[PDB]
Design a protein around this ligand. Sequence first.
Ligand code: NAG
Ligand code: NAG
Ligand code: NAG
Lengths: 115, 115, 332, 65, 65, 130, 95, 101, 103
Amino acid sequence: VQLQQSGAELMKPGAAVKISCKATGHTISRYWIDWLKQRPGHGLEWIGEILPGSGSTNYNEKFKGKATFTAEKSSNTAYMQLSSLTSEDSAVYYCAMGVRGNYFDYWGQGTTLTV
Amino acid sequence: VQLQQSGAELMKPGAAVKISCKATGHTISRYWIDWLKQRPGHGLEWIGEILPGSGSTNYNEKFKGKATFTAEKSSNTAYMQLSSLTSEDSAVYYCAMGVRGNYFDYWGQGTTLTV
Amino acid sequence: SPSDFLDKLMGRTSGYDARIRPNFKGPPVNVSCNIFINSFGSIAETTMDYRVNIFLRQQWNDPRLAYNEYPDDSLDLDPSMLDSIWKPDLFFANEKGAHFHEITTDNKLLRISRNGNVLYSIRITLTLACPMDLKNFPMDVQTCIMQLESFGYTMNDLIFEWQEQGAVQVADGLTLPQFILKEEKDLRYCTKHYNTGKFTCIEARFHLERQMGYYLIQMYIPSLLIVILSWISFWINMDAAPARVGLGITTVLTMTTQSSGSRASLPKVSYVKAIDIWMAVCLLFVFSALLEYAAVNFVSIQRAKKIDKISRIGFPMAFLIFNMFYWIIYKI
Amino acid sequence: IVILSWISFWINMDAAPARVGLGITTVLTMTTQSSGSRASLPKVSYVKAIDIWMAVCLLFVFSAL
Amino acid sequence: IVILSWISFWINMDAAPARVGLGITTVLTMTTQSSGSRASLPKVSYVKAIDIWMAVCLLFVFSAL
Amino acid sequence: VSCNIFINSFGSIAETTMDYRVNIFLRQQWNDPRLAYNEYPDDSLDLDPSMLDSIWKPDLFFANEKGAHFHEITTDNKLLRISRNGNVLYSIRITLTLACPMDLKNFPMDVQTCIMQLESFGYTMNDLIF
Amino acid sequence: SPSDFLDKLMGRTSGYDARIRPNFKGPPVNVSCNIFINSFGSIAETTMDYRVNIFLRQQWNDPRLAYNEYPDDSLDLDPSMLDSIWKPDLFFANE
Amino acid sequence: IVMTQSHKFMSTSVGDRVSITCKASQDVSTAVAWYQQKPGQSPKLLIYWASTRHTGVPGRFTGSGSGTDYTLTISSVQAEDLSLYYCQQHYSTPRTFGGGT
Amino acid sequence: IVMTQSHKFMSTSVGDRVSITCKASQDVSTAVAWYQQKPGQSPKLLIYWASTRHTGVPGRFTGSGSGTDYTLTISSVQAEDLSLYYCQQHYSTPRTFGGGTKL
Ligand SMILES: *[C@@H]1O[C@H](CO)[C@@H](O)[C@H](O)[C@H]1NC(C)=O
Ligand SMILES: *[C@@H]1O[C@H](CO)[C@@H](O)[C@H](O)[C@H]1NC(C)=O
Ligand SMILES: *[C@@H]1O[C@H](CO)[C@@H](O)[C@H](O)[C@H]1NC(C)=O
């Protein structure tokens, strides 16, 4: 069971965009979905968490008010919406799913976004 | 859901009169009914309380033996009967209904009585 | 020490009291809370209830539990020390029988944050009774409810609320016979006023869209088969006087056997349904077969063919007039 | 079923195997009605008003043949 | 009871009150079989394999008369 | 937690109620390493079957248990065996009425995978693993 | 203190006893009381009963509980300390 | 139990910061309400439990204060925002109002 | 919650002993995760809870370390091992990763 994402996009500074994560195999509201920020030069950086049945989150201290977590139960698709894009935000994003703990073992394929 | 009253009346000192409060929307024995005294020049002044299913009251210390609380379950109508009208008693009355606490949010329309 | 951690939290040296609400001599306690259903279902017809298994999350603030010793923000505790701390007094209005679950441990979660906010979760099996309007029983949408309610505290002491985002959770895979759980759920404010005073109430609205897949093959098809079985009475020879009498009387007994074989788990309710009037009109059509022929038996030659001409062709065209009439009205 | 017994008294007089198939099945049906009337009912000594209506309706369909 | 319906198609053609006494009682018997088949059975929406055998055996005895 | 079940009377599968009453013993093992001792040289050592409430216990339950209870018949039927190092053998007797969602498209020829689900409640996965 | 409030009400320093009726060595206790029904019904024919859910209000006087510390007139308490005070012994005949 | 305000009339320019102090008798609770009454019609709830709002009041009406001091704060005054003002306590049995403004 | 590794790169040859000296802020747990990201694809799990392995894992990689020190020990280096490395604590709410090390 592996996740799936749509095509990568390209935006201007100060804008806002949503990132979709199609789920193939099960109902995505059962498990968690997390997000990781890979800005090149630097490394990976976790964003948050969403149970898609609840939508209850724990956003990061550095990422307070950064992301918006919604879900689509009609087609098993998870959504991450951002805001106020700057030059610090050109990165590669991931919708992962780590079952037996806070680590990560299931993935999608990756989406690169450039501000 | 809003309460409703009958027409305002006019009496002589030393008399006694009943004030009706028609209820539109539900069964008035479910919730409380309170009464407030608005004498002009001064302000509002709470009188008492009645659960119309029980008729259990808590009359005020200043209003001991002042009002009489009965109810009409045949048409969802609450009754406040007074006694011994004096010149201190010309006022405006209200049948209110405050749900989430001792304060007041639902009302009727008001009835002015002059002794 | 972790032993000394609870020594400052609870026990002798702490001076904590569990008999006092948080924010005493002041504001009440609002409770953000939701249910985690496990096995919803088993809706009963006669008993008029349903056995549900839930977890009950609730959150509040107990601000007299501040600590700076251990820097952990989220911190689970012993699931049996919950009787040594304050607890809300919630119950269910139509619970009809309920109990805890002490299987291998008190199944009673207790999570305390850094500041004093408390995450709490317990497992409760209910048999909630809903007053069900059954005017159209095979096509009903039954809003069967629960009602949380505080008892030992008035509204100047304790407030129940829902969660701002995601105020109800449904565990996946919960599929039911004769039912689907509708996804949208109304979460409104009931409120109880008793002779003791103002009581806080919150409630859920579970719309039960009934799946009619049982009563079609089991009930409707035997009601459908015997009515058209009455039509072959109106085609046999006119000298079949001991033969035609053996068809309608047995089949109206069969529809009586169908009617007696239709009310087993059904409750005993005053008002009429939509499931029973279909049985009665199918009982009347098979009742209608032989007094046609009993009206023939006073006539009985071509004059009797005229009164059968209404019945040999016009009467088998006289059944779809009600079947289309049935599904229009009570489909909502 | 009581008014169903009235059509016994209108058919041809040569319907000797036909009229016999009406009253006996319907008095069995009222017996099926009587047996289908006492399921949740208690077992009490004195007589009711619900059961004597069943018995007099049983007697009228008994009265036909 | 299904193979019991086959002896309807072998008797004399002047057995007009006799052949009528076979199929109607046996389709009531299969209805008695169907009503005597769902006692401990749950009330579930989707169709089974045990009940469609009862229905097709109900239809074959329905097919006789 | 390495653990397994010792079934006693599996069966009584209900059609309408959609459950089955099973009687099991529940073995489980873990390590409690703060119970080291060098006093008595016995490796395997049984204890009092009522002192188990005075020691740590896992918080397992069953997801579709539908009603369950202990068995205090003449003694808490609750085995407690402590090894030399601190590993604990544990066994209790539980009667269940586990409800399985059964697919009954072909009821006289069905193969029904009726299940139980052990689950921890008062501890997350950074505290307890089954 | 609210902890010291119950210390004078119940417990060790109070000297209260829950095993003694109020107005001991003297008058009896009259109980004004009523029921708050919730789910009346389910009348059975064969079993000849009905399952009812009620609340039971009752009131009396326990005059050995006077206090002048806190000026509140109506005052709710802990819903589990009721076993530490006197209680009526009511039951139902055909329960 | 008397709610004690400070003034009977508070009129100022449009869009000012106005604060209504009303002291209770004792420290009852933070159970403090605020009532606005337009002339010709009924009174209306503003604040309940000294911080919340009635359904249908868009912004610019906040509450604060604890202990022996409680305040209705209006930082944005508009044309319809001058009418009868009243504090309230509802942490006791006598529902006694304030002086009035 | 500050993580501290030693080096971004370590020069070695094929079939040698190589270890990674990660270090957390405080004593969080033995909750230590190791992620290997090859260029062109996703970061993949190596070790979780500082000792266990994945399904379908490279079996020649071991984990150890306790307290304030944790180590991804590699005693057998092959040709496909030329990739990146990361350490992790997952005993808190922020998921603070290590410094990063490409081989
Ligand atoms: C409960 O009351 C507090 C007190 O101000 C408030 O901040 C919070 O938003 C309220 N609602 C919750 C926790 O849902
Ligand atoms: C449990 O964890 C310990 C810790 O290293 C390990 O040695 C053991 O193999 C694990 N599995 C069991 C006991 O089944
Ligand atoms: C109970 O007895 C007291 C004692 O005088 C009396 O005053 C009261 O009216 C009685 N009845 C009640 C409380 O209903």
